[PDB]
Amino acid sequence: MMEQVCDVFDIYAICACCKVESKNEGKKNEVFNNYTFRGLGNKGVLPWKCISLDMKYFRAVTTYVNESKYEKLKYKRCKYLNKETKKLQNVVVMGRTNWESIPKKFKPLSNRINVILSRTLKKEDFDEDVYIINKVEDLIVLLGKLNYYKCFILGGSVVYQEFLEKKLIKKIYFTRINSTYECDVFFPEINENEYQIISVSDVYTSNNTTLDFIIYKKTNNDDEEEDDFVYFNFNKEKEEKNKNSIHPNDFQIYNSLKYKYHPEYQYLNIIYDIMMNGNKQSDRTGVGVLSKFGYIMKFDLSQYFPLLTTKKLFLRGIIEELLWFIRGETNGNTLLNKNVRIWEANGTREFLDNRKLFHREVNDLGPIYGFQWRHFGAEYTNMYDNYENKGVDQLKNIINLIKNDPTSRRILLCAWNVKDLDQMALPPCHILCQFYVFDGKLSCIMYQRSCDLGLGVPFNIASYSIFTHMIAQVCNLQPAQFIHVLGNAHVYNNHIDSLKIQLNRIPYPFPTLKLNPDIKNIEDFTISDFTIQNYVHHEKISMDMAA
Amino acid sequence: MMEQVCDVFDIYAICACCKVESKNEGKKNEVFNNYTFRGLGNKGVLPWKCISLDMKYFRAVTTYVNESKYEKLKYKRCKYLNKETPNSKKLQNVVVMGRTNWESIPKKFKPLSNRINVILSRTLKKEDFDEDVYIINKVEDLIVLLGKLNYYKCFILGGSVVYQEFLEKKLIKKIYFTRINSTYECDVFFPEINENEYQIISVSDVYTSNNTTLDFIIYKKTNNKDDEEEDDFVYFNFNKEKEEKNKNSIHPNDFQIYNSLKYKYHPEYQYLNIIYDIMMNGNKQSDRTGVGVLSKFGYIMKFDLSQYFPLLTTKKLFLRGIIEELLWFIRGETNGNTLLNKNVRIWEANGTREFLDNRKLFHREVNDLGPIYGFQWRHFGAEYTNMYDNYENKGVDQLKNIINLIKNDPTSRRILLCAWNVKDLDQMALPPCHILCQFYVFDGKLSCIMYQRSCDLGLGVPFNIASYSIFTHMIAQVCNLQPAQFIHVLGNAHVYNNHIDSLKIQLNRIPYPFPTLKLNPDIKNIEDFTISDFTIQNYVHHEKISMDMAA
Numbered sequence A: 001m002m003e004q005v006c007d008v009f010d011i012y013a014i015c016a017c018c019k020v021e022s023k024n025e026g027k028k029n030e031v032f033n034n035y036t037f038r039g040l041g042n043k044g045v046l047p048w049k050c051i052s053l054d055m056k057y058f059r060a061v062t063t064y065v066n067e068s069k070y071e072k073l074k075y076k077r078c079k080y081l082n083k084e085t086k087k088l089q090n091v092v093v094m095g096r097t098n099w100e101s102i103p104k105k106f107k108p109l110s111n112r113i114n115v116i117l118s119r120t121l122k123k124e125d126f127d128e129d130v131y132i133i134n135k136v137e138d139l140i141v142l143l144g145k146l147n148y149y150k151c152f153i154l155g156g157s158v159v160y161q162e163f164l165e166k167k168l169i170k171k172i173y174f175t176r177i178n179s180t181y182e183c184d185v186f187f188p189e190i191n192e193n194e195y196q197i198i199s200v201s202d203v204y205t206s207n208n209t210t211l212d213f214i215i216y217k218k219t220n221n222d223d224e225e226e227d228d229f230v231y232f233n234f235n236k237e238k239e240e241k242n243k244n245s246i247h248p249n250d251f252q253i254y255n256s257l258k259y260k261y262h263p264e265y266q267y268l269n270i271i272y273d274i275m276m277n278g279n280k281q282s283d284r285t286g287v288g289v290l291s292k293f294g295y296i297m298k299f300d301l302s303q304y305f306p307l308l309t310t311k312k313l314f315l316r317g318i319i320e321e322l323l324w325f326i327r328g329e330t331n332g333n334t335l336l337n338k339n340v341r342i343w344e345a346n347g348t349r350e351f352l353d354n355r356k357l358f359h360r361e362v363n364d365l366g367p368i369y370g371f372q373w374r375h376f377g378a379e380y381t382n383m384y385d386n387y388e389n390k391g392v393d394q395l396k397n398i399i400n401l402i403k404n405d406p407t408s409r410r411i412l413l414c415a416w417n418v419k420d421l422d423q424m425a426l427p428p429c430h431i432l433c434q435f436y437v438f439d440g441k442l443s444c445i446m447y448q449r450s451c452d453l454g455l456g457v458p459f460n461i462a463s464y465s466i467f468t469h470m471i472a473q474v475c476n477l478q479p480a481q482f483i484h485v486l487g488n489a490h491v492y493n494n495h496i497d498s499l500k501i502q503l504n505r506i507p508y509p510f511p512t513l514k515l516n517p518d519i520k521n522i523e524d525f526t527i528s529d530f531t532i533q534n535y536v537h538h539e540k541i542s543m544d545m546a547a
Numbered sequence B: 001m002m003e004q005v006c007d008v009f010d011i012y013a014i015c016a017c018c019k020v021e022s023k024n025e026g027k028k029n030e031v032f033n034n035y036t037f038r039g040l041g042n043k044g045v046l047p048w049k050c051i052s053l054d055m056k057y058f059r060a061v062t063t064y065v066n067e068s069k070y071e072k073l074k075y076k077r078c079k080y081l082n083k084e085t086p087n088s089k090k091l092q093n094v095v096v097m098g099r100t101n102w103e104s105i106p107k108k109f110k111p112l113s114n115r116i117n118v119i120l121s122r123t124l125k126k127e128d129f130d131e132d133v134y135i136i137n138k139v140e141d142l143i144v145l146l147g148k149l150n151y152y153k154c155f156i157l158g159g160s161v162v163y164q165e166f167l168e169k170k171l172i173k174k175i176y177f178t179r180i181n182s183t184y185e186c187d188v189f190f191p192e193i194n195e196n197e198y199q200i201i202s203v204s205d206v207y208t209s210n211n212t213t214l215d216f217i218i219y220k221k222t223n224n225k226d227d228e229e230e231d232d233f234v235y236f237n238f239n240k241e242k243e244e245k246n247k248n249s250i251h252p253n254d255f256q257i258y259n260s261l262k263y264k265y266h267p268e269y270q271y272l273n274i275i276y277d278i279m280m281n282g283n284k285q286s287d288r289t290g291v292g293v294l295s296k297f298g299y300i301m302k303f304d305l306s307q308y309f310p311l312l313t314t315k316k317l318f319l320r321g322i323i324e325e326l327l328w329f330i331r332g333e334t335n336g337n338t339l340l341n342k343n344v345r346i347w348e349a350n351g352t353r354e355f356l357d358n359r360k361l362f363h364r365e366v367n368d369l370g371p372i373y374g375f376q377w378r379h380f381g382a383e384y385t386n387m388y389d390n391y392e393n394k395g396v397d398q399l400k401n402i403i404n405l406i407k408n409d410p411t412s413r414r415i416l417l418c419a420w421n422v423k424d425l426d427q428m429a430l431p432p433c434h435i436l437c438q439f440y441v442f443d444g445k446l447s448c449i450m451y452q453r454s455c456d457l458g459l460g461v462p463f464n465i466a467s468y469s470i471f472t473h474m475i476a477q478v479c480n481l482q483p484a485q486f487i488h489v490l491g492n493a494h495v496y497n498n499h500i501d502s503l504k505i506q507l508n509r510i511p512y513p514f515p516t517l518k519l520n521p522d523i524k525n526i527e528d529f530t531i532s533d534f535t536i537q538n539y540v541h542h543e544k545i546s547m548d549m550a551a
């Protein structure tokens, strides 16, 4: 309860950490944690040539002040010391090595009170307007004397260490750089009982890496139109709905976070919203769900590939599926021969016979995505027929309107062929997608009529994200937004335990997708023209706990 | 005058006002304004038996206190008067109501629980009463009782007269004004509010209570004469544009009444804010028609049909054409003349020789619109020939199928009605904008999503909202369910360059509470509806706007 230094004098640490080159630590079964991000420097410079968005973030935090909050901080600080009574600046503190690695033309740091820690070096040795100190104790005395907003520790491996050892840091402002480099200095392992994440930013691309910004907080061990809001909330109900079956104690960490801006939260929050406010319902499968109806998610494919990080996911299978679609295939055996089993259960003798498809060969799935994308309208015979120049080739159509009529509002691909639903092994979930083109950029809306949140939505996001990059590249456009519209959104009763676990995981920065740039026609991609870079993830989860 | 009277003592009016029956006019050609809502009382009661949500609200606005904001208010109060006024353990609000008003309440609920009650009169005095209650005699005598009392905020309940005067004399800071959207006979009316003194700053959601709609609004007195994580917020915003892009074509000063309002909770703002987003941040693009648009991609609107019918009130819309279009669609029709011989011109331009010829449909008769929505709803996949052919029992009767699925398998996720038939697209006059709707059922209630590939926000979307909101009602009734939500998903969402000026006007108007839709309850099959089975009640609206202001 009694006041600790770091509160009084508002001491904070700010770092940028990349991932560190290790050989023989097989990228095949790499385990990932908070400590994955820990690279501060190499040979006395930064690990990376120039990540300009961290530079800009860094200057923004370390130079920002609120004059109208200064009086409060002064009272709070004078009242601590049994005392009383140009522009306000922040103080910044750094070690000697750090300072010696910054070029003359940038020191002393503009618009900030610079302070060096150093046993050896001394003040007669500096031309510059800078404070020298030789014990952390001396910084306290100094902050006592100066007029300043906030104090920031800009590091040094060693400086971070001891300010963290002595609990002097009230918050860490940590940039996770999602890229690997050669490093010789490292950020201390953070004690998860002393510091815990309270905030996560949006994910960005700068200079060919993704990255985000998190905040650790130290763990405890007119003002009038505010009544007008209360008045409007007068119809604030009894309590919640699933406050009986689902406990908000089950999401301790999910809820501990103040700012949850990482876009993986457009998925996670929908999950939480169905758990807390789902409608309880039977379904075709019998298993049962909580459902709601009608959501939209948006992913900026210019900044990142939205491969969920709160559990593991592999893409081989869904790319093959995507290429099978494009090829116009309806033969289930093609996929089983590549050890992809996404459609295995929909093409068994027993399954087909439940659909009343008695005269259908095993693994002949009928007029499904592939067939509708390349031959909408044609009469389906069997999966081995030659269907060339039969039906409407929707796919070639929309590649031509994107290239030649980009302002068209009719660039749609539709799998929901009312006349063939009954002949499909089963009716398509991804009803359709619509394209939009502006300024050499392609965005894509995909409407999903039925959305298994636990297990299928994650893959589906990835699936139509990749498909958007493919279309954009064969049309000489850049991808912009994949937009995911969800109709019947539901969580299956057997996913609830895995999903309670998943929503208490904190996201990592997303990876990026690279396609072989040489592929100029939608029909010419192969599995090897696709690479996933910098996929950092939590543990695989078994969405169902029986198997 | 160094701090204002009403400011210091926190004087607030709270009222509820219904509409009033004029005698012999014509109600589908009447003008509306803020004044449309005046009716206070009749024969010394409420004009309405009981409106329960306005009671809940009225008590919570008068009973609600915040102990911890009091210091700042006590401080600035005693400071004004030049004095220093421990008491009733819980702090309480003053309520200030004239005799007529006091005398027309029942004494079972008197005085008003958890409120310092006051009264005005010259017929009564302290002695023939409780010590609890107070009474004054003039206006200026009130200010006096307040400063010599512990109270949070003071609320004029008044009466015609009490409101009438307090408001002459500039002693009201804010009016909490429930607009009750029905009509009743009234003797006693709330006064015309001067606009140069008071302006609306906040408008609530729209609700249904005891078979009427209503919203709560707030007028404000116009000027005449852990902050830990507030920074954390500022640091998360480090990468923002210092500029709106279409601020060179479309200026925020062109939106002064839209941006004035603090809380804009009325459901119509879901449409108006989309328009705003487009005008400020949209993308300059050309299109097929050659007018050019500002466009964006992907939005959701949601409308609670259980609480209101969402017919836009910031401009005038009519519904006969779009209902006859709905009925034409349900019947399977593709003949354009059926609508022209009822003077519905919705599909006229698309059935011209000229237009059909431009679609390369040279062997199609005028007004044969091809295999459009109707045909696909009732005969999806059949061979189209001409608008007079007989299609009984050909194609898939999607409309029939979804009705059976809602009734007999309501938890299906395959209840969809699709009009985008890839095989027939080029045979259609034009391809459908309303790609599909999907249906969802829970606890005896039906909701509908509709996906729209192309959305003309200025002219089309308003009719589209209403059109599928009716349809959702129609399907719900013939499957013995209650409408819940209509959800409208927009794809290519565009504002036509010629509509910019008109929308600027429109976005600067303040919604009225929404009307309601009534269907004849005998109708139990989707084929049996006729025009006469649909009644719009209590449509209050601004004046018509020609969106094209060329003619």
Ligand SMILES: NC(=O)c1ccc[n+]([C@@H]2O[C@H](COP(=O)([O-])OP(=O)(O)OC[C@H]3O[C@@H](n4cnc5c(N)ncnc54)[C@H](OP(=O)(O)O)[C@@H]3O)[C@@H](O)[C@H]2O)c1
Pocket: A014, A015, A016, A017, A039, A040, A041, A042, A043, A044, A045, A046, A094, A095, A096, A097, A098, A099, A101, A117, A118, A119, A120, A121, A133, A134, A135, A136, A154, A155, A156, A157, A158, A159, A160, A162, A185
């Ligand atoms: N990416 C990032 O956010 C980030 C942040 C910081 C640093 N870095 C990198 O890491 C490198 C330096 O790492 P480092 O930890 O070896 O250098 P450092 O911690 O910046 O500075 C070490 C020096 O500061 C002094 N010092 C530390 N604690 C002290 C105390 N209690 N009293 C007096 N003096 C004290 C000592 O000065 P004497 O030598 O004079 O005793 C010591 O040599 C840099 O060149 C840079 O590339 C990166």
Ligand SMILES: CCc1nc(N)nc(N)c1-c1ccc(OCCCOc2ccc(-c3c(N)nc(N)nc3CC)cc2)cc1
Pocket: A014, A015, A016, A044, A045, A046, A054, A055, A057, A058, A098, A099, A101, A102, A103, A106, A109, A153, A154, A155, A174, A175
């Ligand atoms: C921007 C790097 C960074 N990001 C974050 N988030 N936290 C930090 N503590 C740091 C950090 C700050 C200083 C530091 O000193 C080691 C020296 C190598 O780092 C440099 C050197 C020069 C510059 C530089 C530059 N390249 N260009 C300009 N204009 N100004 C500056 C100085 C602010 C930036 C960092 C190391 C890390």
Ligand SMILES: CCc1nc(N)nc(N)c1-c1ccc(OCCCOc2ccc(-c3c(N)nc(N)nc3CC)cc2)cc1
Pocket: B014, B015, B016, B045, B046, B054, B055, B058, B101, B102, B104, B105, B106, B109, B157, B176, B177, B178
């Ligand atoms: C609650 C109605 C209302 N709403 C709003 N928004 N503003 C107002 N000024 C008023 C209001 C207007 C005039 C008025 O004057 C007397 C005529 C009202 O007659 C009443 C009022 C309340 C009740 C009543 C009731 N029926 N039930 C309870 N529990 N408590 C009460 C006392 C408020 C019965 C009759 C009282 C309140």
Ligand SMILES: O=c1ccn([C@H]2C[C@H](O)[C@@H](COP(=O)(O)O)O2)c(=O)[nH]1
Pocket: A284, A426, A427, A429, A450, A451, A452, A453, A456, A457, A460, B412, B413, B414
């Ligand atoms: O890519 C897919 C494919 C299938 N499903 C799910 C949704 C439903 O749980 C089930 C299909 O159920 P029906 O909607 O066909 O009833 O499969 C997905 O979520 N994503």
Ligand SMILES: O=c1ccn([C@H]2C[C@H](O)[C@@H](COP(=O)(O)O)O2)c(=O)[nH]1
Pocket: A409, A410, B288, B430, B431, B433, B454, B455, B456, B457, B459, B460, B461, B464
């Ligand atoms: O019910 C309708 C019908 C049409 N449109 C508009 C959208 C476009 O402005 C135009 C159709 O143009 P294309 O998108 O087909 O080019 O009509 C609507 O908004 N609602």
